Amino acid sequence: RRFSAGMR
Amino acid sequence: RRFSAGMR
Amino acid sequence: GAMGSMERASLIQKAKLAEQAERYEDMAAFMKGAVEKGEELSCEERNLLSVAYKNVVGGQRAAWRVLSSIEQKSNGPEVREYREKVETELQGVCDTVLGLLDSHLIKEAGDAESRVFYLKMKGDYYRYLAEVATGDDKKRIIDSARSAYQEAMDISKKEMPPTNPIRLGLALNFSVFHYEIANSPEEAISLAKTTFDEAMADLHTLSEDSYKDSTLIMQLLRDNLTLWT
Amino acid sequence: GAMGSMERASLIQKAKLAEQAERYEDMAAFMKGAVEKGEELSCEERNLLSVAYKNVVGGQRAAWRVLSSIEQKSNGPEVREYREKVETELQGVCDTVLGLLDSHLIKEAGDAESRVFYLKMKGDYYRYLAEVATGDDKKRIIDSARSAYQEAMDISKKEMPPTNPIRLGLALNFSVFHYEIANSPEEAISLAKTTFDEAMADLHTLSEDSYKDSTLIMQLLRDNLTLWT
Ligand SMILES: N=C(N)c1cc(-c2ccccc2)c(CNC(=O)c2ccc3cc[nH]c3c2)s1
Ligand SMILES: N=C(N)c1cc(-c2ccccc2)c(CNC(=O)c2ccc3cc[nH]c3c2)s1
Ligand SMILES: [Cl-]
Ligand SMILES: [Cl-]
Numbered sequence: 001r002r003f004s005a006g007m008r
Numbered sequence: 009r010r011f012s013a014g015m016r
Numbered sequence: 017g018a019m020g021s022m023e024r025a026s027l028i029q030k031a032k033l034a035e036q037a038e039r040y041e042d043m044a045a046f047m048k049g050a051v052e053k054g055e056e057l058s059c060e061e062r063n064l065l066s067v068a069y070k071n072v073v074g075g076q077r078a079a080w081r082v083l084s085s086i087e088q089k090s091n092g093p094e095v096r097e098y099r100e101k102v103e104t105e106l107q108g109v110c111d112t113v114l115g116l117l118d119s120h121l122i123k124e125a126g127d128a129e130s131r132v133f134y135l136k137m138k139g140d141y142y143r144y145l146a147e148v149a150t151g152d153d154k155k156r157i158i159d160s161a162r163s164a165y166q167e168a169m170d171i172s173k174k175e176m177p178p179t180n181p182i183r184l185g186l187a188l189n190f191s192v193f194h195y196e197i198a199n200s201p202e203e204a205i206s207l208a209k210t211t212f213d214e215a216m217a218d219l220h221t222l223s224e225d226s227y228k229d230s231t232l233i234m235q236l237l238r239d240n241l242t243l244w245t
Numbered sequence: 246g247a248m249g250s251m252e253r254a255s256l257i258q259k260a261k262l263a264e265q266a267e268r269y270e271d272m273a274a275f276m277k278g279a280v281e282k283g284e285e286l287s288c289e290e291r292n293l294l295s296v297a298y299k300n301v302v303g304g305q306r307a308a309w310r311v312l313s314s315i316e317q318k319s320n321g322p323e324v325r326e327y328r329e330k331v332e333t334e335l336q337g338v339c340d341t342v343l344g345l346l347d348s349h350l351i352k353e354a355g356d357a358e359s360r361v362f363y364l365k366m367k368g369d370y371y372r373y374l375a376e377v378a379t380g381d382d383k384k385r386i387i388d389s390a391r392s393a394y395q396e397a398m399d400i401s402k403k404e405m406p407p408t409n410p411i412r413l414g415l416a417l418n419f420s421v422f423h424y425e426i427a428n429s430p431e432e433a434i435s436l437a438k439t440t441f442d443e444a445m446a447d448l449h450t451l452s453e454d455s456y457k458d459s460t461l462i463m464q465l466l467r468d469n470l471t472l473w474t
């Protein structure tokens with residue numbers, strides 16, 4: 001699953 | 009931490 | 017109740033969906049609604065009730081322990097206030113579960129499997145109350161947990177084999193009660209060891225699937241004995 | 246608001262305690278109360294607000310995805326009903342955050358660091374609305390996310406270095422918007438690659454600590470490019 005900033 | 013049943 | 021207008025079967029279906037979604041507060045609300053329909057619960061349904069509230073109260077207990085540790089180190093009002101807020105919410109969940117057991121799951125449980133399950137749960141939620149108790153009711157809370165556990169043990173020894181997973185989980189939790197609530201570590205060790213050994217001697221009677229169920233809980237008893245000795 | 250009687254400083258202190266306790270709904274309520282005091286937020290405080298709601302909406306989004314998958318496979322009313330319940334709660338959280346940004350965090354943000362932070366958040370919470378949108382407002386939701394992200398990008402390119410972690414996380418999330426919301430995978434890949442390369446060429450200006458901050462987010466851009474190409 002791709003990363004967004006909130007999940008670092 | 010000791011185990012109780014709920015955390016198997 | 018806010019779940020009074022929903023079908024029992026729909027509440028059970030939604031509790032299972034909430035479990036898959038890791039929405040345990042929703043799962044508990046749905047199972048509370050199912051209980052309040054007034055019919056006895058099946059084995060699967062009892063398990064859904066137990067899992068839901070285990071997860072809800074488990075998050076509260078873990079939070080309480082973090083906050084209590086911070087509070088102890090600090091010894092403004094904020095840490096005490098916030099620990100009290102979590103504590104009060106935790107106590108409210110325990111009171112809700114105990115209320116479901118008393119009105120009327122236990123009195124209507126006319127099978128050893130169901131009655132032992134519910135009496136174990138009663139011991140568990142009085143135990144969680146005891147973990148945070150301090151005032152003039154702590155000793156009565158502890159005795160209420162002990163009494164529920166003991167009645168469940170008495171029934172389970174008469175009516176269930178020593179490998180039954182409800183019996184094993186009951187003995188596991190009663191041993192934890194002895195060790196960290198009742199300040200009876202030798203009782204705790206004795207109970208875990210006798211439970212483990214009597215289950216071992218009964219494994220030969222089991223199918224491959226039941227053997228996996230029983231040995232899973234035996235491993236928890238063993239790991240506790242390793243920690244305590 | 247239920248937090249109107251608590252001191253601002255006490256709300257911030259309790260938000261930090263809630264974070265340590267993994268009580269993110271409480272953390273969000275405390276930070277909502279702090280915002281509603283009407284003073285601008287510090288860098289640390291902005292981060293506390295972002296972390297709190299990230300975790301709240303993140304659990305809702307993960308639950309929604311589980312339920313939507315089950316609903317798709319099924320295609321009684323229970324699965325749709327329960328997905329709708331979670332969806333409605335998620336939308337309510339997004340509306341609350343957007344309301345805090347509009348009343349009045351963004352208009353009072355008179356520094357690039359604060360204004361870009363809030364405009365990124367506005368894009369993020371319109372994006373979460375877009376993930377579940379289907380009806381006659383989906384296209385307007387997407388355009389609202391794009392507009393907030395674009396204004397934040399414009400400011401960040403003028404006012405921040407290419408290694409600034411807010412700028413990097415903004416570009417990361419705008420690239421995710423392009424890829425999976427706007428159906429613009431080539432825009433997404435182009436943005437991630439240009440952001441990564443311009444940050445790399447700026448690393449030589451940084452301290453050891455800033456270098457760790459920036460390269461952490463660069464790694465997320467790289468992992469996305471690996472997934473998308
Ligand atoms: N949704 C869930 N989480 C569950 C649904 C059912 C279920 C499903 C269908 C019929 C009956 C029960 C569960 C049943 N587990 C037991 O009976 C059991 C067995 C072994 C151990 C060891 C420790 N505890 C145990 C419990 S768990
Ligand atoms: N309680 C928390 N979770 C935090 C408290 C503070 C804080 C504490 C004191 C002063 C200022 C801020 C945080 C600050 N992080 C940043 O500025 C920053 C740095 C690097 C990256 C990379 C991705 N995102 C980033 C954010 S996080
Ligand atoms: Cl509080
Ligand atoms: Cl529902």
Ligand SMILES: [Mg+2]
Nearest residue numbers: 022023024025
């Ligand atoms: Mg009916």
Ligand SMILES: [Mg+2]
Nearest residue numbers: 251252253254
């Ligand atoms: Mg004041």
